Write a protein that binds this DNA or RNA. Structure first.
Lengths: 236, 236
DNA sequence: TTGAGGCATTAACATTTGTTAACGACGATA
DNA sequence: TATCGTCGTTAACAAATGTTAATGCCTCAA
């Protein structure tokens, strides 16, 4: 919040202007690999990839402020062919070309650490998500994904913890957990309603047994405690 | 590697001298969190985590030279509770306190960008691995892990590509794929031998149909092409 | 009001994977 | 030489997941 806003000012004082994106349009994509250093300031986006069969995969979400790399800082080559779709109504972004990045960082040292810090946050997040999505099959994958959603998009209400997210269909949850068919996702969420872990109200998800999700995503809950401890405190 | 040698001479100049670990040792562990910056210079290691009920998870392997870190750079707090076990007969490691690192990379930038490069390699590697493991179930996870081990520990032989890796049991393949029982991995392997994809010789695996593994792990093959071009080029 | 499309739910069937046990090969020990 | 433990293989069964289709609820357009 603070270390990021300080980074914003350093960008405006170097000619980097914020380019605002609206919902559903792709900042970068997998078919036109262009190496940038996206600095999502305010907004919500999802990193996706489309197989050759047209199969969709949602790798993760990004809520500003955060940094996303589409190319390497040295070789200036692509880190992978992915898409960064905007899913919030409006999201402002400070896009930076990979070339000038190496220069802007070598000047200010405190902001080099910031980008380096967020990259470490990225690594720990991927290992934890990988650890919990592999042990308990797809039930644990849905539980882990839901746990992630509750922490960064959750708010406490008398009905439970409301996950403030439009859309969030059965199809979209399946993409974030590697489930291709919507019927399979529903079959699992119908078990979580039976178990009394979640309820479906207002086309919106309320979780009531957060501990049940921790048992299926202990490494992810461990990550929020160590990486985003403020987000962890709101629910503990 | 050149960058890893300049870095190695940079550490030896500032008083950091190597340490020798033997097989089965743990550089760090998940029960005594110490925040180091591990510069694995020569040797092979696997990052693991033990769940509270005792199930092992093999997150990935590390082959020197590379950079692993158990704590964040600015806060110096743990990034996660993992074990780094030495699986080669011996390994040469340069342990450096997390605080000393901030000053060292502050003096010399070309080594700061080298550490940043290795981290970008880590991010894109985790996203790619998470992509191919989540889409095709356990068959696609075993196929993905084998693809990783061929590019890194594979060599052209008359019987295909030999995975030059010792003590690669069925358990260790399962731990890397979230499979808990060696019976399940043997079942998947007997099918890959049936389809003439691999052969089991002298407790080692020989890969004879690399293209079969690419169709089940396309983004990992893409990652080796974009991140480790030299390693990839030796098998195409 | 009627009718089209998308989403959620459930059903059923097929395939895969989880789980445990038995068999046989191999090494190592005394 | 006999005996013990480790590992791979296969089998059998239960459970989970992949796949398809049918149904009902809801929105929207005319």
């Amino acid at each position: 919040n603070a270390q990021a806003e300080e980074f914003k000012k350093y960008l405006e004082t170097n000619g980097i202007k914020p380019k605002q994106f609206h919902k559903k349009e792709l900042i970068f994509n997998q078919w036109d690999p262009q190496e940038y250093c996206i600095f999502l300031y305010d907004g919500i986006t999802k990193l996706t990839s489309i197989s050759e069969n047209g199969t969709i995969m949602n790798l993760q979400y990004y809520k500003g402020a955060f940094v996303i790399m589409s190319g390497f800082i040295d070789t200036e080559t692509s880190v992978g062919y992915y898409n960064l779709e905007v899913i919030s109504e409006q999201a402002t972004v400070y896009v930076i070309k990979i070339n000038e990045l190496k220069e802007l960082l070598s000047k200010n040292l405190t902001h080099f650490f910031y980008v380096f810090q967020t990259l470490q946050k990225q690594v720990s997040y991927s290992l934890a998500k990988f650890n919990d999505f592999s042990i308990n099959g797809k039930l644990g994958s849905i539980c882990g994904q839901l746990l992630i959603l509750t922490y960064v998009y959750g708010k406490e209400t008398p009905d439970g913890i409301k996950i403030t997210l439009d859309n969030l269909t059965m199809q979209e949850l399946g993409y974030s957990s590697g489930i291709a068919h919507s019927s399979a996702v529903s079959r699992i969420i119908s078990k979580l309603k039976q178990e009394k872990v979640i309820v479906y109200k207002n086309s919106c998800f309320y979780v009531q047994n957060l501990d049940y999700l921790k048992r299926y995503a202990p490494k992810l809950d461990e990550w929020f405690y160590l990486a985003c401890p403020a987000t962890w405190g709101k629910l503990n």
